Amino acid sequence: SVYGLQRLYIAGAHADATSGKTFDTFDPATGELLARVQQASADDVDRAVASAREGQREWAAMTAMQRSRILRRAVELLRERNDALAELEMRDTGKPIAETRAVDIVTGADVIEYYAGLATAIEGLQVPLRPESFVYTRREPLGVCAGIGAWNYPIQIACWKSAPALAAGNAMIFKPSEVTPLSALKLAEIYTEAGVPAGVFNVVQGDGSVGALLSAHPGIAKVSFTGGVETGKKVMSLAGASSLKEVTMELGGKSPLIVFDDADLDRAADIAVTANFFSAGQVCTNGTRVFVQQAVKDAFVERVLARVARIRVGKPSDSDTNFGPLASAAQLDKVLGYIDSGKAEGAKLLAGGARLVNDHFASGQYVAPTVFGDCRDDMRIVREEIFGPVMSILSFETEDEAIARANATDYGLAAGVVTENLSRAHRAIHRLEAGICWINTWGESPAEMPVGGYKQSGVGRENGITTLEHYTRIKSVQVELGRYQPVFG
Amino acid sequence: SVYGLQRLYIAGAHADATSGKTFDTFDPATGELLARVQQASADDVDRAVASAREGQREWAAMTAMQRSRILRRAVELLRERNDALAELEMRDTGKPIAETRAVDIVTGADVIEYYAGLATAIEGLQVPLRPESFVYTRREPLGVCAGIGAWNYPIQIACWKSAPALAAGNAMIFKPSEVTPLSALKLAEIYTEAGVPAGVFNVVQGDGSVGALLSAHPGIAKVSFTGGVETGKKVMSLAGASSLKEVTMELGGKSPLIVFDDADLDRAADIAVTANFFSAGQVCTNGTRVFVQQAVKDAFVERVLARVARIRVGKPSDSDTNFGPLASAAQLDKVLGYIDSGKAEGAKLLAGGARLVNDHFASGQYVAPTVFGDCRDDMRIVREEIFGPVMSILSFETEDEAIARANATDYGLAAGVVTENLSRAHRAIHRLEAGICWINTWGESPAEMPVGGYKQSGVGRENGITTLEHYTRIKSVQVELGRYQPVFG
Amino acid sequence: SVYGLQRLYIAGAHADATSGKTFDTFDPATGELLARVQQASADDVDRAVASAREGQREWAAMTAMQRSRILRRAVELLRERNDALAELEMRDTGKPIAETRAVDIVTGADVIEYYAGLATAIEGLQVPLRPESFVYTRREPLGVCAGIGAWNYPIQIACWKSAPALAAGNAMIFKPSEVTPLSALKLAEIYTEAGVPAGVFNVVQGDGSVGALLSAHPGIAKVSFTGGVETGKKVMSLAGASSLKEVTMELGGKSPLIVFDDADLDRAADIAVTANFFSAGQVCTNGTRVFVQQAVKDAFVERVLARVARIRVGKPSDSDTNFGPLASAAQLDKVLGYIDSGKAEGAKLLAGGARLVNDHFASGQYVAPTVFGDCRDDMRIVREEIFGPVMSILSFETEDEAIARANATDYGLAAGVVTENLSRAHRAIHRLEAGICWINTWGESPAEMPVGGYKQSGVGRENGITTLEHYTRIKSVQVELGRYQPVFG
Amino acid sequence: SVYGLQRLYIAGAHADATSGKTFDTFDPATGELLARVQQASADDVDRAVASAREGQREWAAMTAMQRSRILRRAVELLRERNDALAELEMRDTGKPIAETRAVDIVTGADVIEYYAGLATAIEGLQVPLRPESFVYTRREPLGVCAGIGAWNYPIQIACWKSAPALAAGNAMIFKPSEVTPLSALKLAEIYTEAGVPAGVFNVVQGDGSVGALLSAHPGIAKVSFTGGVETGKKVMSLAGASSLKEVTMELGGKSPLIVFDDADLDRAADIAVTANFFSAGQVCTNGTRVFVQQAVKDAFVERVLARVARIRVGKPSDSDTNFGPLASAAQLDKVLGYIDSGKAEGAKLLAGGARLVNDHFASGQYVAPTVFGDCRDDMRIVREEIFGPVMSILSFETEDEAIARANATDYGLAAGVVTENLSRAHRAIHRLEAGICWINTWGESPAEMPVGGYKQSGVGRENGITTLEHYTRIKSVQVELGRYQPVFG
Ligand SMILES: NC(=O)c1ccc[n+]([C@@H]2O[C@H](COP(=O)([O-])OP(=O)(O)OC[C@H]3O[C@@H](n4cnc5c(N)ncnc54)[C@H](O)[C@@H]3O)[C@@H](O)[C@H]2O)c1
Ligand SMILES: NC(=O)c1ccc[n+]([C@@H]2O[C@H](COP(=O)([O-])OP(=O)(O)OC[C@H]3O[C@@H](n4cnc5c(N)ncnc54)[C@H](O)[C@@H]3O)[C@@H](O)[C@H]2O)c1
């Protein structure tokens, strides 16, 4: 194996698990074994909670500025090690090195940096009731938080969950996806090197059974989960049933991109291609239902296909590549099944549609960038999240029609519109039932911008000032300065 | 029956249920039948959701000030009808008319009044990213919210759940406790009279199975529940597993009141009595573990018992009464079982301890105000919420000991201290793991003050500005004003 | 006279001044004497301050909700008396009854209503420093505030200054313009009837020398002034030099309206006419420099002139009138001098340009709606605020040129653009140096929206949540719970 | 001279003035000439404004995080150079090296660090008006700001004024006191080294005439001033009269320290000594009216005198010194004049009272730590700020008396109480008319805590989130998405 045996990270050090079990992580471009990874046992999760409880006490007793400085040092280390971490993330995920060098660590560190600076701005309120009595609130740490990661943006997710948790004075136990377990360990080392106390960021490893141990643990105050809707429902159920934990969930989507007849069509085609094929289509917010107004449909499709034909499919370790394999064979099987469904249900295959098996591609999990035209709302590929590089193009006649069809889903993660018109841009966005909305762009997720789902695409939010506040619990304190008037007299 | 046949309230009118089933509500002071009440079916809940969806559209399309004015009119009607509603609430709950006339409707209307004024102050954010792009957020209504009530403060709970929901532009379907189904229908009539559109406040009736219909319904965006911890775990589980609803939960407690050696002991005894015997002990925030420092224990207990002996136990319809029956026979059986447990495990009975069965008391559910001394942390009466008039007095030696023992519970609703010392008052409160904290007072819950539980006593909060914010969902809108730089070039 | 002798309003009643001096107010449509008005002396201002100090104590001692309810009662009275107050305001100002019935009292009451609801939401902060110490802030009333009014919106200005001051717990002494002294006394009667304590809203009367008495008085904590830039500089100077008062200033402008080549030209012409001729041109925020892109200049001008020709100039007491006289002979002389200047410097007269003196118009102060074309940036009519019905139309070629020329002024009150393009609308507004910015509309000033000037057009803001915050002063309280470590040991 | 010829700092470099004039700065411990400093001319101030305008454009066009990183680098440099800057500040001010090494740069950098992290959290609002229209606000930089410093905390004041100004995207032109001109130049170098663009922090030098050039300059948007009340009144007057600048002022005080009969008397004596003799008494917030309740007066005075006798008066360059000379001969003359007044008016001299003239002290400006007892409210030393090491002790009988006498002043900067009682601590502080209030401590000014004066002790605030917001101006933007309804039709 490339990276050897990897283990748990508890109490400021790498540590042997006590399960007697390991799992494998692979390079999905080559099938090379990257590491054997020890799986945490229930005892290990218990120990990680005890460790986090102890570290949280020391961390929360520091001043807000002491925490700020330590997180700022972690940011420095992430910037310094960006390229090395990007190489590891590329190996583990299959995403192109051109992506992991520019996006994954950059934006992960961006959010740690943002919350490092805001760690001093967490304030309660004060309000008088009368001259003799007033109320103040404290925003106290929750305690020990759990984060459960997905495999498409492993280190970015670890950063985005741990940053507001740590900035607010919590500890976090993080479990990466078993598909991509490696970079979370590097973040744990960096937090320790930056000065984070032992236990404040612990990493446990394993499959969903280890995630369930975290969701059920009575010593954990909050769970933050990124993954599929079916798993999210199990997590929220168990986290609530076990000990009434606070919950945040980010759960995938079938987000609509609406290209109006007064769109800039070059802009629209660029957006649609980014919104469907970045990270080989494995992005929760991807704009996978592309609604295009009839009058510009043919011109728009011509532009999309010309851009899709120029995608540089290749080895993700090659800097010239901008589209690589999917992250697993299970991914490839599911995506190819959806492509079969689209063909069977009468969608028109306009580009791609098959696994690449020539030369080195045969050793990886490569599916061509795929575009279906003449799609209908009742098709499986239109109704269900594919989580791969499959664009569905749907025509519409009127603005009201596009909005109604865009909203006719139980998903609600993202939405976007392309139009040059001032009124249409805002009025359409205001009617779309999604938490993350883009006008004349797609995909950017600034640290300042709260992101999360409507409907079954999630609960709660990440990023922005509001998310830092949601990693605290409110204590209201009423001070009575006057005589307590007896109620029983 | 006193009040006749009572039904559902859907789409601005009373309406027949379709379950084929009814349940009875009684006067717990006399056993008189107050009403036969129709139970909602699954199809009735569906109809209530469709009605709420329609009303929510009209309500949200109004301006914030239009909603504010209508809620202010509802406040006027609640003030005008205070005494008539207080009589109804006294009949249904058994709480003294002296309480329901001064507290239940007054404070329910107080919170509607507060949120009416704040309905115009729900604001998103704006933040620039660069000259070419900026973000704004919208705080949009969730849609249809569900509220599930408890029987100890029926109309107050209905007011506190519906006020922020309606002010933020939502509709609410409310289910009162089957023990106290009557006053919620009066609130629904009042909202309609005040100008609330049909469907914006609907009432369904029934036992826990009807509450579960609401928690599972895919058309409901949020559930707010008041009740016991074990029911709350079931609700949060089903609400999350069904459709990833947002959840607020207020779940009872075993709140500590710490009387220090430098407390004003008259103040402390007054607080302890209020904190244990108001509403015949049926208050979630009651200070039912009374910790008293050894040096003042005997003097404190003497003062407590002198006040307990002056409690005016009697018919709740008599204005001179300040302590009446419990709300049901099941409540009485549970409370009497706890008294049996306390005696068996060795707690010293200092006052009360038995059912009152002389003269008219035999026809009601009356338990004497009960005080146990020499309690231990391991006793069932100290570990478990009794939800009746049973005070447990525990001695301690040191401040560190009192704080450790106060925190050694999975509950976390309220806490309080009595001390004349500036440093001790705040330093102790800051270390107590509870959401609702009182210094030299107990029990007041101003509209401005967020209230809710730590640990297993709750999720989320009620009241205060922050609670209005959590009856909206955040939509982030990024506006790109410049060229979209192609990612696939 | 129509309304008789009018006096001061101090300590909850009308009261004789002690200056020995009076001044007259006239109806600018007819020259009829409306009232003889007593002028306040320095000793009267002292008495008003002592009265305000006493009333402020009672008012601030009330709860926030008590103040909220009283302000809401004042709103009810203003709505009930809207038409009678509108008639008075039309007589005193000369503005059409169609305006005063729909705008002046409606929007004055709108802002009192908004702040009434927010009076309960004034909150300080709390922030911990370390376990042993924390800070909270109080937002305390300033004390006695002064408001100085202008004659174009007399009762609206009185409402907008007094509403945040009173909601925050202050008293206010208000001096209306000597041109329009009457409606402020009616507002003072209404506040008293609504339950405002004696002294909380006092009215003094007189010219600028009485305004200076308020600005200099050592017992006044803050001055809010509406008026011309040159008077404002005198007020802010004296307010600061006398006792370091806080200051809010709203000072008029020369606001640009930019009509782009992709504007809806019917929309643009409607906006331009409203933005220049409402209230006979006597609006501080009027868009009196109308920049029009060359390609649409002729078509835009044709539409403007067609609308100007349909303005209904007439008696302001007739409901069919939508354009009446100016508020005084001094105003007319100034406006006519500007028209003379524009003609001399070469501006092309397109409409209007002279006093109306036929039939009844001869008895009033009427100037025709006037439009100049082919204007230059160096013209006096383009550089200087006219405060009358005189539109200056300026052609431009490029967007960069329009923005540069729009910004090339020491004014900075308002600005606006007309364009159908999403990018242009926001990018242009973000570059315009004005506090009040409109896209595809003009003139609306919602209670939620902070309004005020950049550069020499003002200091501070009115309306919105932030303005309520600036009618309080911050007290920071640090609580030390631990040992004070000696600095001199 | 020790440091040679020092000059202006404009456009990223040291620069020759064009006045032909210099002034001298001295070491007040020895009379050694530290530097000749060039005085800025009017042309130099004009050039500094043009430079600041250009640098502000580049600085504001950066992202908030780019500004944050550059300010964070400035903090690193200040930490690295703390001891060297502390030595310079000790030479220029006369304050003990034990103070300048621990306080002046530490807390100056603390505030830059705080605002560096908050530079990303400056947000406007968004609020809907109706489906067809919404408002958003921008918080835009003011532009070029001016800061005018005092000599008691030269580099700390430069940091505290420049930090929120720069974090919010402004440039600042700073003029240090001519008594202490040196360390502001070092801060300017550090900002440049950290990456601040040329012109964003410029330093001009000279006496009050140069300060007046800044206050009058039409290109400056805001003035922030620290100094005496008489000068503050001139600054606010001229800043308002010239161009309606925004103004912040911090202006000295006569702050009361109230020692109650239930104070910890050792704590109280420690506080009183710190609050009167730190920085040789040259602190604006010093607690120079020490009110002591009669029952503890003698015990309190005995403790104060014992601590005063242990003050280590000596050379400020000696690390063992904790009390050095005053900053100038003019200071010494004024302080000795006040001491003469106290003696003449009958105050009892309890400690100190004279200049130290033995050995090396004769070459410095040394006044002994001085305590007066049996003071009265009508004494000059009690009514007027001395700005030197002169404590006035006043006895009182009742709590109401102490509060009334504490408030009977036109000052209102700080106040504090010493008491062990919870109720008394808060109820007294809530009644004291001062912006900066301390319970059982004195003098700490955390970055999170807004600080400034009531009454004639100031306008506006420094520090806290609120001050960052006051270095922006609000632009409200109304977007109309629907049809503009013609007003003239
Ligand atoms: N503020 C609070 O935290 C608060 C106040 C009042 C009561 N309580 C708690 O309520 C308890 C009362 O117990 P109880 O057995 O009479 O009532 P409960 O807790 O079982 O029921 C409360 C409400 O939930 C409904 N319900 C019951 N089972 C449900 C289910 N599975 N799904 C959905 N809704 C369901 C009930 O019909 C009722 O409306 C007290 O012991 C106390 O702990 C809490
Ligand atoms: N919102 C605004 O910015 C706004 C709205 C209305 C009017 N204005 C301005 O008001 C101007 C009207 O000019 P005007 O000469 O008739 O009135 P003005 O500006 O001189 O006076 C306005 C008010 O200030 C008082 N006043 C006058 N001199 C004073 C002094 N030295 N100290 C204190 N108060 C003093 C007046 O009595 C009156 O109440 C218009 O040209 C326009 O620029 C501004």
Residue numbers in the entry:
A (entry chain B), B (entry chain A), C (entry chain A), D (entry chain B): 2 to 490
Sentences from the paper on this structure:
As a part of efforts to develop new therapeutics and diagnostics for melioidosis, the Seattle Structural Genomics Center for Infectious Disease (SSGCID) has determined the crystal structure of betaine aldehyde dehydrogenase (BADH) from B. pseudomallei (BpBADH). BADH catalyzes the irreversible oxidation of betaine aldehyde to the osmoprotectant betaine and is being investigated as a drug target for drug-resistant bacteria, notably Pseudomonas aeruginosa, because its inhibition blocks choline catabolism and leads to the accumulation of the highly toxic betaine aldehyde. The structure also contains 21 helices, 21 strands, four β-hairpins, four β-bulges and 25 helix–helix interactions. BpBADH has a prototypical BADH topology and shares considerable structure and sequence similarity with the ortholog from P. aeruginosa (PaBADH). The 489 amino acids in each monomer fold as 20.4% β-strand, 39.3% α-helix, 2.5% 310-helix and 37.8% loops, forming six β-α-β motifs that contain five β-sheets (four mixed and one antiparallel).
